[PDB]
């Protein structure tokens, strides 16, 4: 047909080695920009005054970091939530000093990843698949939005978003516990059940299907060669896996519908990680973990400490040391 | 389509109640997070100034002013961590504002007791508290039974807006699937991929 | 939190591997469940797809071929072998927990990955050198001193206010 | 940075030895 139709047909071709799609049209440029900036900043970016106090943190390999300590440092607290594109700086040197690469990377990345999710829907439509893989991915995506966007919004500064580094991640987690007692928050406890249980059910399903592979190979070749790609039939005996697992526990604590079983594997980690993403997102608005400090007292009124009071002494150690030069007034209200 | 709309609206609601002190008056809802944080700097400026401190020339430990510093576009603003919140505007604070930001002469002369009261009230009703309604930072002891209406409303509506985006994706994807006729699964007899060339 | 403040356990590569295995297992759990549920063949005529499966059927209930193409074009590579995929699901989390166990055996002996000597040499000499690694240690130091007296009461740790490490104001 | 200069040779062999092992097994597979 005409030119715009050739193009539309290419963009949405199910024959490209990698599907592009209309979401891909936004995803590709934004991820490329985020990736190139992140790689260059991680190696070469100079120190960044993250907390706005003219106390720059070195995050890059060339300025004395290794893989574990290096990071792209969040933008300055002096900036708060202001948009700080390159063109708003008077010079690249000013932009690097105040942590601009961080804004550029995370905005392009949230955009790119939001479109990655749409792309998963889009291709499943072109293939005639059911559409809800993208729903599963919403759990990890939601989590990234929380640490990179929502938490900075509630607290009023990208300087408190998560750093883009291994040790920077730890910094963010320790400060968080100090300020929100996240360990004592049920949404985070739901996140741990999500991922623990996901790991468990992951090992279980794999162990249980592997346990009931049909002998289709000899002892000298990999069992795996007993499965041929696209084969009409199944290569394990689900009835035997139920027979094993039903007896391991009891007959009805075990799944015998392959569809019910796989739906469960999808829902358990996704739901739990939804909750822990919502946990960061609501602690962003300072609705914090349970507070049981001095909750037990005796007939006279002495405080009888519990394990919650012992946690609180660790929290206090984090509180009083973190960003040690950044507070002038006794309360750390954001 | 409506779950879409509603989700976007819930997120906007969430930021309205968190930042806006006009249609969510702090008289009724408590102070915003920015507002409480600004209020604390005011409180201790006031106190130290009464003791005889010159708050405009007080260099804090970092070399930045202890009470007052410049925003990145040069406005005079409160110092310390609250430097992030200098965009805050509220009726108790705007009278100290001049053309270049906070005005040191108005700070030295014109602060009334009603501002010291509001600033002290708002600093001690900052929207921080625990799920079981212990008010304050997470290391605070039990005593104060308080969680800001602003926290309650913003958290509830973030959660609600989020799940409604999920509903949007669920029902939009399904609607598309159902309109094309493969919401119930793939047709073994005409499996679309089997009619496509291999990627390699 | 003890393990953070005294062992710097987050910095330990054996824990790092265990984290990868547990979060990777959760990932595998979710993506395999979702992939199967969204590549089902239409085997009944109802909208609830659960009723269209007989545990005694011979046939795969979902399409490995369409699943494979989807992920090849979304993510670049895909599984092609059902046995490898379910063996990988066993391996990843089981191997992660094993690696974490090794590191705790190390910590039984205080054989920690606590420090990076090269950063400490630089930092001790250069008061302008600061990284997220030094920031985290300052937090560790706060945890140990503020929590030890009550946490290890049998030591009768007495720390006057004036020795407690604290940043400005807080 | 005052790093361990034996780290370079440790890292290099950490990589080369097992990688070579794999390459050798793979190539002789493709040739039968």
């Amino acid at each position: 047909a005409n030119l715009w139709e050739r193009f539309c047909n290419w963009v949405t071709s199910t024959d490209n080695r990698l599907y592009v799609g209309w979401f891909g049209v936004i995803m590709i440029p934004t991820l490329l920009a985020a990736t190139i900036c992140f790689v260059i900043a991680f190696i070469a970016a100079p120190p960044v005054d993250i907390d706005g106090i003219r106390e720059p943190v070195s995050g890059s390999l060339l300025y004395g970091n290794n893989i574990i300590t290096g990071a792209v440092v969040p933008s300055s607290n002096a900036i708060g939530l202001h948009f700080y594109p390159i063109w708003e700086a008077a010079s690249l040197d000013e932009w690097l000093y105040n942590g601009g690469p961080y804004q550029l990377i995370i905005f392009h990345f949230l955009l790119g990843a939001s479109c990655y999710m749409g792309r998963q829907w889009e291709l499943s439509y072109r293939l005639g698949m059911r559409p809800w893989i993208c729903v599963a991915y919403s759990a990890p995506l939601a989590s990234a939005f929380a640490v990179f966007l929502i938490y900075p919004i509630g607290q009023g500064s990208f300087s408190d978003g998560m750093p883009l580094g291994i040790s920077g991640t730890f910094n963010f987690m320790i400060v968080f516990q100090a300020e929100h007692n996240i360990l004592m928050h049920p949404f985070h406890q739901l996140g741990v059940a999500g991922v623990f249980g996901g790991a468990l059910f992951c090992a279980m399903h794999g162990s249980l299907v592997t346990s009931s592979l049909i002998r289709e190979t000899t002892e000298t070749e990999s069992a795996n060669y007993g499965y041929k790609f696209g084969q009409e039939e199944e290569t394990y005996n689900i009835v035997a896996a139920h027979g094993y697992f039903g007896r391991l526990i009891f007959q009805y604590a075990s799944f015998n519908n392959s569809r019910s079983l796989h739906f469960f594997l999808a829902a358990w980690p996704v739901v739990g990680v939804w909750f822990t993403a919502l946990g960061i997102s609501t602690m962003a608005f300072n609705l914090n973990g349970f507070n049981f400090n001095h909750s037990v007292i005796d007939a006279k009124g002495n405080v009888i400490n519990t394990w919650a009071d012992i946690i609180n002494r660790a929290n206090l150690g984090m509180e009083v040391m973190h960003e040690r030069n950044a507070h002038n007034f006794p309360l750390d209200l954001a | 389509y409506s779950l879409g709309a509603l989700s976007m609206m819930g997120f906007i609601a969430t930021c309205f109640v968190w930042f806006n002190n006009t249609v969510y008056p702090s008289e009724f809802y408590g102070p915003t997070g920015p507002e409480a944080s600004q209020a604390q700097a005011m409180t201790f400026l006031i106190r130290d100034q009464k003791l005889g401190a010159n708050v405009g020339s007080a260099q804090g430990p970092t070399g930045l002013g202890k009470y007052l510093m410049r925003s990145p576009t040069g406005e005079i603003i409160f110092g310390g961590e609250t430097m992030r919140f200098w965009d805050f505007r509220g009726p108790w604070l705007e009278p100290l504002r001049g053309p270049n930001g906070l005005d040191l002469n108005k700070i030295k002369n014109d602060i009334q007791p009603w501002q010291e009261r509001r600033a002290a009230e708002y600093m001690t009703h900052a929207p921080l508290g625990s799920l079981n309604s212990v008010g304050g930072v997470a290391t605070e002891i039990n005593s104060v039974n308080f969680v800001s209406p602003r926290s309650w409303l913003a958290t509830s509506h973030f959660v609600l807006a989020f799940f409604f985006l999920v509903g949007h994706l669920w029902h939009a994807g399904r609607a598309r699937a159902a309109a094309a006729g493969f919401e119930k699964g793939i047709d073994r007899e005409s499996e679309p991929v089997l009619s496509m060339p291999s990627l390699d | 939190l003890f393990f953070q403040g005294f062992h710097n356990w987050t910095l330990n590569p054996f824990h790092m591997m265990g984290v990868a295995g547990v979060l990777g297992g959760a990932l595998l759990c979710a993506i395999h469940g979702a992939t199967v549920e969204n590549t089902l063949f239409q085997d009944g005529e109802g909208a609830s797809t659960f009723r269209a499966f007989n545990p005694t059927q011979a046939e795969e209930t979902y399409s490995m071929v369409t699943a494979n193409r989807f992920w090849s074009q979304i993510f670049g590579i895909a599984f092609s072998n059902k046995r490898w995929l379910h063996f990988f699901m066993l391996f990843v989390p089981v191997t992660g927990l094993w690696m974490s166990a090794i590191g705790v055996v190390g910590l039984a002996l205080n054989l920690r990955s606590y420090d990076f000597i090269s950063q400490e040499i630089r930092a001790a000499e250069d008061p302008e050198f600061e990284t997220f690694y030094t920031k985290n240690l300052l937090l560790n130091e706060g945890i140990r001193a503020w929590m030890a007296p009550q946490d290890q009461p049998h030591e009768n740790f007495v720390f006057p206010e004036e020795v407690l490490p604290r940043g400005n104001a807080l | 940075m005052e790093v361990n200069q034996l780290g370079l040779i440790a890292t290099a062999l950490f990589v080369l030895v097992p990688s070579v092992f794999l390459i050798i097994l793979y190539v002789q597979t493709e040739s039968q």
Partner: peptide, 30 residues
């Protein structure tokens, strides 16, 4: 030398991605 070592390893992985996607053993329906 340490910076060079980290960057070299990271660059080999990126090349590994390229070959693993575009020069994979093609999945065929046997």
């Amino acid at each position: 030398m340490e910076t060079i070592t980290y960057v070299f390893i990271f660059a080999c992985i990126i090349a590994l991605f390229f070959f693993a996607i575009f020069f994979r053993e093609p999945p065929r329906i046997t």
